[PDB]
């Protein structure tokens, strides 16, 4: 019944905006004004220890 | 769903691409089913009628859904949902102090 | 504009008290249909099956809520979005929801209300008459008449095997002229039966059951009515007969027993002794149609009727072929009769029922429209009877609106057609020679 | 949008195979309505005469040819212009037309048939039902059936000096549960009747004229049938009663003689000991009904009636009143009576109905809405009887469909009606105390 | 495009600038209606109950915000969605939003303003005046009205104990013959009372309130003022009376006490003295109405009251019924005065107005349409009157648009009827006898 | 659509019981307006005058049928064809038509109803409101009101040689609060005027006319209902005077007689002592307002007043212009004055009442928009004050709905624009300094 | 079917050959409106200023991209919705929305250009002329020059 259309849905929660600061200035994490996040994304860095 | 209504434009779409008329059927489980174990599952109570079936697939990316609109008090024309969309700026936002952060360009 | 919005049945009664039901459809921008399905059999081997209740405590166990319910639950909810024009993707899809060759689930009372409403909600739209929308443009011919005159059989006390006795007013020029004439018979048998002293109550289609001495007394008062009502037997009006021998068929001994109506005396007679009796009955009188001469299953007498008398008498199978396409497909196959009877009810589609019209009308029968005991004040069977231009038509007799309706329907469509209208009498009656 | 364009009149055939008229109304906008008129009598000294074309060369005299070119030729020229929904308007302008107090230039069937062919397309222009137009807003009473079960007088041979008898199912919670009851009833019967080997077959209302012994025999076996259906005389069912007294009254003795129908050995009663007959009987079994209990010109009689019966018993007058105003309101001013038989056809047009209606309402008397002994398949007389809220409907057995439509229209009224819907049963009794 | 799609609701004021409310309802196709609601009282047992603020720093604690809340943000959002021609359903569910016999919770102001907004809307939407809508295609009686000419008791000064006196032009031709009448006798009375030096200045209901000596001077002015205009007490115009008994009512004594209103020396009367008073009175002059003769819990002395002159006078319970349906059914069983007073706001809803005038009708009550101490410039309560056929009104005297307001819808009204238009007068009394 | 189909007047009484006329112009779109005249003048040597019957045996000479006859059977024919937005051309029609400076062939009151009736049509054409109609998009200023509280001259029987006293909410916040204070300090006089024994009932526009003992004593009562209503006089509530000095002023002397109201004990004051007079008072009592201060033929008075009081006060021309512009041009020529009265039937037309409101308005004067004696349930001179911006209204007391219909109007418009709307109060006296 | 569906601008010229706006107001039944805005001066100590790109590199600094992605971004999703009629309300919102008295966070030339297309638009609906619409039913004086 729930069946997936084309190449399916995004998948958006909602969470409180947040602007942070950067060496670039000030950013924010969503580029919309209905508070809507990319669900599950995360950003890394690796290092050599 | 009050503010919104159905748009003229995917109603002519759904009459003359007859979506309606391929419609698939669903036991309690959300499995296809044919329209005669369909009709027998609704008949001895096992399927709710209401929520069992789909019409079709409309194409063309077209806008399902238009605003509303209502009379104001003087009997002019206006948006359901325009004037009391919101009151408050939420506040917000929190600047958060990440200066010490490698981006990658 | 065209979709439909809504599909609605509700619990009615037909001409006998009994339960019915009736459907309403409406479709997006207003226009509405209703088709009232008329009184058939819950029960039936080959034929298509009405949907009863069998609850005792309400109606004597004939209510009709199950299938009220299944238009609204189930038929309602695949038939709403569907295009009202779209007359045969609905009853196929109809068709397809109820899974079963004999319309026993959802019900043939169900699907044929629906399908009733659905086409004429759909001529309501397109602001035509409904003969044609279901026929097209070339729709012209009024039926005649088999006008149900005189009852026997189980429908009467009187020694009769034979069920129904009709007059034909094949002889005249125009519609409005055949129903007059059929009424004013009509009253001068009530005159006669009451200087008779026998009874003129009339039963369910409107037709007189007296106290007669045979089948030929029957006949020969008939004829007098016709002749005090100043029309010529054998030229303007003629006789029909119902014999419904399945009623009074031996299957066991292979015999037509004739003593279970007309008492312990009656002649016992085998196929090829109703076969030359029926010879005798068309020559002594002016007989232009039989019906159901025959048992249902008795194919090799049906054919031994047909070699006989089918070159010049009209033999109907009613319950011969049940409106079955494939009975009667065999029945061509087999040349047996050379027309059919038509019951919308018991093949419970529209489409079917015209399938089965234009495949008689293929092979040289005559396809005659026909009522059912328990009717409405529904009166489709006369637009599916101009639509077809079947030319013959058995809607009852001259006594209850439930047949009245009908003939009223009738001369309403021959007004609508003014001038292109045709009454062709005996040249509707194509299947027979001369 | 409204203004009526076309006005357009045929023959049809009512109930009992004589010829009436319908009248079809077309405005500029495309709404559509069709009114039947029922056969009534083309003889009377103070109420509507319909007009017939007299040749005996065509349906015995009976032909409205005469009607329905008054319609097509001077009607027509005259409506064609007024709005839709000024029935009041056009009802007056035809009244003044005519210019005949009996309405014998233009024929009341031909008037009456405009009158209800204008109202239906008015409802049909607004998108509303015919009893929302017809009554306002607060319609909202479905009416109690009196179904007549048992026949006598002049429509039976049985010695039997009453017209008929009727059956009240006043203990129902709904409409629907009363056809049911009313239907179980009528089946019931007819299986008791079968059981004695008397009649089954129907006469023009639908009821049973089997060969009781008299009076107490019918009503006896009326109270039968209603306990074998499982309900109570006296509190679910009740009984009523068309005499018909104008029948077997001898004017010049001042008497009742029952010998017109009861045979050599009937009882002749005066004015008193009528009214203690009908005491008796209502005394003797549960009577709730009493219609034309004294004859039509017997005032004093009446009066008598009215004062012993008239608080516990409903009298009604069909053949005192005629559907007549100066005679209703005479009744009023003496105390004769307590109801009052409409009749739509007997008066002539729907606003001359309806101020017969309300005057009766007025009066603290009942209006109950009847049918004719020659019917339609039209159920307007179910739509005026919820309209006016008058909760009494007298529109005759559950056996045929000139009977049947009128109950399946209730049936539909009360479904659209909903949750509003009110069945009073006994609280319809409003001219009777407790 | 019926859908209803916005109710909004405002604080007004009302003839005595003390607050109301109005709402306005608007469909989807942009029918508009606005309903005005007259003030009534918020306390009593068992009538429905307006909502105040209760805030004394605002309008004296008499405003109506808390209503007006009531309707934007409770009823509101209950009936956006419904039909605005489902007057019905629309009341009901209203009521059974409320959930108190009474209304108290959301307030019978309220909830019939919305009633009335959604009346007129619907009338709107259809294209049809009010009272066609209300009271369908045969409303065409126009009132007789009972107009406030001298008032006494607790609305003035002068030793007169009966709260209001009316003049009743029941000999009129027409609607606008009775109007310019009652505005000359008006008049003429004025010219009456400035000769003799009493007092001009008009009351709340616009009739004047001079210090006469009594009720029979009172009386006297009134037939000469009839006379000086030019017209025939007792066959042109008649006297009506409101006694208002209740408030000169001692409970505990179980007297009518004269003294609180007529002085010192004024007469003490039993139940009894007070018909015996009553019945002098109706002998004395042409008073033809009589309201609130008794106490609203005096049934005994009301009963007796119907006995003795309810077949020449016309007995109106305006406190005894206070419109109530259980007070009805109580008084009419009783035989209980002849005619009930049909305030709206002491119901709240349409529908069950209409109720009570049908329900007072079917028992040969006459119901007679008032007006409030605090009205508007609504005028709802005219249609209403000509929608049931009512044939009586009472809607003040003739110096103030919360009258004339009325006065002049009559007159819109009738021209609109043209040559329908009736007005009974004198026959509109139907409770009384000849 | 916008096509002027019909134009139909009739006969309706107004506020006094009086005859009066209004309009129903209709256009083919279905667009409907009503235009209802308030009862002026028929004579007058430079004002508009009004036609009456003069048939002393009707409505005592008053009745209004000739106008009637011109609006339907000579206006009407005129004006059919034109469009409905074309008011300026309608209204320059009419006038054309007419031909009398004095509106006198045809009426006055045909001419205004006409052209109310004609732009409410409009109005209602184009779905906007009849003040954005009749101003455009910027119509947002609320008046200030000028309630008429106390009576005197020749509308009392009071020594008060002034006609009357009002209250000025000029200190509110909103409309809505300029009312709420002005029925709180309407009742607070009531319940003082109740415990000091004076009279309490009504005069034509709502207010007391009390037997006080003086000028002063009526402003002294009136100064402390404001204070018992808890506002401060002089800072929220003003007083104002319309002392209708034309009526007390001998012409033969050149001197104003209080003698002929005040009794024969009051002094008789020439022009400079009438202006002390005014301006003793004027220091005494916070009185912003005098109307009427001077003869409507005392120029040089005027002048002298204006010299002398207008820079703090507001003087009222309402006899010395009577909406004449030609009167109007002389007054702001020699600086007589600095607001006028304007009387929308004093005039005649709608675009002649706002080209005098325009030029007051570019003059530096204030234009006023009054009710008459004899009110209608018509409400066009809110909708007229709204559209003009003009920022005064008066429209009399707080106490009858020929009075309260204009306020609630007000009440609308207020709520309908919402957070746009402006109540501008002591800013609305743009012609005083500060 | 008054509504304002549409509300966009665009960058013309204006006499002198120098940068301004035009605004076009689109209701839902198709009424149209174009309003276009006298250029005026960008510095002012109480007068409405006008919003100027300010990169010599277009225009001499002279552009109005500004304003009109004002238009195009901010008043046109605060102004759909309205009724074309309701010029005060959308005045009086498009004020508020500005925030500042002399309005320069949007500009007044946007603004102006809004008002003067929602005015022509609604006389467009109404199918009244302009001036018919502004004045109401008593204008009749032409200007003397």
């Known amino acids: 019944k729930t069946k997936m259309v084309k190449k399916g849905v995004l998948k958006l929660t909602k969470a409180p905006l947040k602007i942070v600061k950067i060496p670039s200035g000030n950013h924010s994490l969503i580029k919309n004004h209905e508070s809507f996040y990319e669900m599950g994304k995360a950003n890394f860095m690796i290092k050599e220890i | 769903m009050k503010n919104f209504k159905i748009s003229s434009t995917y109603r002519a779409a759904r009459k003359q691409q007859k979506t309606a008329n391929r419609k698939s059927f669903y036991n309690d489980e959300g499995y296809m089913i044919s329209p005669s174990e369909w009709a027998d599952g609704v008949i001895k109570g096992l399927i709710n009628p209401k929520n069992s079936w789909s019409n079709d697939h409309v194409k063309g990316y077209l806008p399902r859904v238009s605003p509303r609109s209502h009379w104001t008090k003087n009997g002019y024309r206006e948006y359901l949902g325009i004037g009391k969309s919101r009151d408050i700026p939420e506040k917000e936002p929190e600047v958060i102090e990440m200066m010490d952060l490698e981006l990658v360009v | 504009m065209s979709i439909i919005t809504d599909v609605y049945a509700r619990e009615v009664l037909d001409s006998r008290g009994n339960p019915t039901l009736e459907v309403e459809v409406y479709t997006e921008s207003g226009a509405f249909g209703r088709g009232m399905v008329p009184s058939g059999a819950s029960t039936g081997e080959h034929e298509a099956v009405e949907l009863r209740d069998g609850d005792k405590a309400r109606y004597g166990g004939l209510g009709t809520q199950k299938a009220v319910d299944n238009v609204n639950n189930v038929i309602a909810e695949h038939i709403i979005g569907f295009d009202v ?39 309501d739209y397109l602001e035509v008459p409904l003969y044609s929308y279901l026929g097209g443009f070339n729709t012209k011919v009024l039926p005649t008449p088999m006008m149900n005159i005189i009852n026997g059989g189980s429908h009467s006390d009187a020694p009769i095997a034979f069920q129904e006795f009709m007059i034909v ?56 009515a016709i002749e005090a009502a100043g029309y010529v037997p054998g030229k303007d009006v003629f006789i029909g007969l119902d014999c419904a021998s399945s009623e009074f068929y031996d299957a066991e ?120 005991s328990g009717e409405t004040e529904d009166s489709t069977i006369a637009d599916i009877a101009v639509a077809t231009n079947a030319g013959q038509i058995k809607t009852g007799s001259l006594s209850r609106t439930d047949r009245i309706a009908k003939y009223n329907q009738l001369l309403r469509i021959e007004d609508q057609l003014g001038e292109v209208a045709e009454y062709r009498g005996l040249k509707s009656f194509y299947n027979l020679k001369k």
């Open chain 3, 85 to 123: 024009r779209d007359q045969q993707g609905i009853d196929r899809a109809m068709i397809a929801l109820d899974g079963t060759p004999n319309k026993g689930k959802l019900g043939a009372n169900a699907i044929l209300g629906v399908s009733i409403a659905v086409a004429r909600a759909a001529a």
């Open chain 3, 253 to 372: 001994h292979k015999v037509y027993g004739y003593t279970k109506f007309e008492g312990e005396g009656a002649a016992v007679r085998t196929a090829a002794e109703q076969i030359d009796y029926l010879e005798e009955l068309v020559n002594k009188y002016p007989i232009i149609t039989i019906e159901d001469g025959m048992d249902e299953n008795d194919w090799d007498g049906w054919k031994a009727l047909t070699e006989r008398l089918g070159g010049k008498v009209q033999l109907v199978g009613d319950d011969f072929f049940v409106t079955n396409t494939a009975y009667l497909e065999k029945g061509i196959a087999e040349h047996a009769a050379n027309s059919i009877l038509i019951k919308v009810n018991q093949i419970g589609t529209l489409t079917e029922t015209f399938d089965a019209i234009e495949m008689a009308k293929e092979a040289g029968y005559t396809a005659v429209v026909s009522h059912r």
């Open chain 3, 169 to 224: 007013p094949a002889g005249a020029p125009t519609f409005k002229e055949a129903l007059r004439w059929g009424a004013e018979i009509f009253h001068a048998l009530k005159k006669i039966l009451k200087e008779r002293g026998l009874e003129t109550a009339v039963g369910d289609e409107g037709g007189f059951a007296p106290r007669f001495n045979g089948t030929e007394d029957g006949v020969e008062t008939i004829i007098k």
